[PDB]
Symmetry: C2
């Protein structure tokens, strides 16, 4: 029997996250994701994911100073930056800088802390602007926004909630890629670089970069019905919808939809995305619902980030989940090595080249 796609296959035991696809609920070590997205911060939730408990006032304070002290890129990395092309995709930029050369958890903390610096530096560089060094007096998210635009805004809160919602979600394709690589006992950077590659795909995190163009292709709320029907006929995948586990609304999508409704109700992109959901759900089209990529992409756009950084923004948060899983998994490691059903030829002879059918 072939189990293509591995749907429903449990590849490990985990206490990190419970994904309730039937009721559309997501929990980080027992706490509802929306509670954290609303009441927590990047550092506090990351601490919770890595350490297994909410930090006390002093623990959080010390942890925030730790992450803030890990935001620098080595001097040599900076040298490489100024010799890179200025039109690279941000996911690839991350791969590059992660590939230049308990303790594993300390390593995870450090790599996560530098992600925003890599993105911000490349952004400034690619646009010929002076670099804005990390500020130790700013939080992880505040600082990212500042290294990007040299200013601070209330919108930062919305971005922080978004990161929290995207930090973790069981064994999705990118987390699974990190686990397969981690199962060979390879280094943490290698696991992350593979995860990045998977997250980049249009059938995974990359769908976030495809949504904006799709929404524009639709054009307006009046053209939604026609676009959807066309997609069904052509068997074209509607980006921002569908999921392997959720059999109903994606709680992260619901949360972000509310964010947009409350802060960017007049966004043309949001209006179209909202109408698309209305049509697909009200008509029960394929029994599919919006997934987080539909609204996270719209929020990132409205917050002023480049479209080719959307997947990297997802990674900036999900790196926490990826590393948490790698750490947990290897604590009792098992090489992941499946197989296939052979359907090819048998007993084929090597024919000397001069006797081969012309």
């Amino acid at each position: 029997m072939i189990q293509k796609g591995l749907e429903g296959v449990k590849i490990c035991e985990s206490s990190i996250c419970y994904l309730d696809g039937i009721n559309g609920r997501l929990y980080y070590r027992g706490i509802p994701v929306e509670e954290l997205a609303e009441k927590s911060t990047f550092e506090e939730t990351a601490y919770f994911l890595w350490y297994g408990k909410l930090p006390t006032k002093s623990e959080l304070e010390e942890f925030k100073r730790k992450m803030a002290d890990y935001r620098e890129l080595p001097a040599e990395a900076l040298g490489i930056l100024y010799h890179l092309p200025k039109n690279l995709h941000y996911i690839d930029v991350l791969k590059i800088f992660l590939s230049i050369h308990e303790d594993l958890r300390e390593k995870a903390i450090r790599v996560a802390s530098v992600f925003p610096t890599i993105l911000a530096y490349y952004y400034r560089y690619s646009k010929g602007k002076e670099l804005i060094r990390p500020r130790k007096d700013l939080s992880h998210v505040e600082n990212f926004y500042y290294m990007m635009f040299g200013e601070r805004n209330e919108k930062i809160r919305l971005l922080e909630s978004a990161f929290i919602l995207l930090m973790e979600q069981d064994i999705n394709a990118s987390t699974f890629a990190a686990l397969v690589i981690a199962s060979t006992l390879s280094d943490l950077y290698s696991c992350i670089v593979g995860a990045l590659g998977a997250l980049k795909g249009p059938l995974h995190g990359g769908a976030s970069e495809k949504v904006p163009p799709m929404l524009e292709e639709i054009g307006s709320e009046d053209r939604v019905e026609e676009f959807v029907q066309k997609c069904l006929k052509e068997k074209r995948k509607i980006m921002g919808f569908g999921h392997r586990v959720y059999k109903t609304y994606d709680p992260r999508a619901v949360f972000l939809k509310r964010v947009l409704q409350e802060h960017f109700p007049d966004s043309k992109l949001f209006r179209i995305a909202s109408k698309l959901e209305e049509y697909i759900v009200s008509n029960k089209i394929k029994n599919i619902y919006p997934n987080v990529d539909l609204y996270s992409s719209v929020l990132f756009e409205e917050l002023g980030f480049p479209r080719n950084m959307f997947t990297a923004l997802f990674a900036t948060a999900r790196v926490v989940g990826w590393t948490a899983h790698v750490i947990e998994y290897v604590s009792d490691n098992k090489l992941i090595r499946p197989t296939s059903e052979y359907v090819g030829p048998m007993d084929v002879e090597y024919i000397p080249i001069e006797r081969r059918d012309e």
Copy 2:
């Protein structure tokens, strides 16, 4: 039920390679791997793996000229090279250069053609030597050896046989990593970079870099018994032995053992490795046998390659298999997204920081 490690799980149908773990046989599209390793060449077997048929005289000639025409690194890549640290691991070097920005098969052919150039250039650079540009009048393997050492030797034939033996082997960890990433419809480079990360692990291709040091740790044939017994007591993994599928001798290991016996019988490393096999197999220790990593590593050492390039040498060949699988799989794609058994806490409340247990 949990299926940790995915042993025996068929994740797809494939006509590329048949792995007979029970009888210790390996076939590439129906042809025994040792037949190809003995009678074929890198380009001919790669052609066979990608196109599904042995090439005619003219097809092989044209294919060899094609690969030879794809050996150059873009001018910008060269700029980056001279700003990189000189102590990077070769697998990481490959990641870097693959991350700087039918047709998929054409892409696979081009990437495979440049692998040796990346390795040779970094080798020369790291050692402060002048680069030796790819020579279009030389074969894929001949040229690699020449860009590395600026000379041609008969030993090249042994290296070519080794590459052929390592080009492909069903759904191993690195091929699987490439497939997981490929299932999201990510780009070919991303799939390869993830595969590289997995191959690098000590429980996978990386075992090849661990063998030499292990052999030296043993010291001599007289100390083999003591070392093995010690490993059993400490539950230490004996590198170069064991396999998920082979329940007996690894045909590639057998082939390479003969190569060493015929060309480097007096190699101290070979003598130790041979004695290790004798003791483990004759005493039926854990019913394990040598895998290809035991002898491929010894051959690479005797051929004069740096130990931290051994896994990259494996990749130089296996990239053919990785890409062949990606191409085949996505022709009828299916997102790979498993799950886990949740064993963590439930119904946990978010306690305001001021009320948390100090």
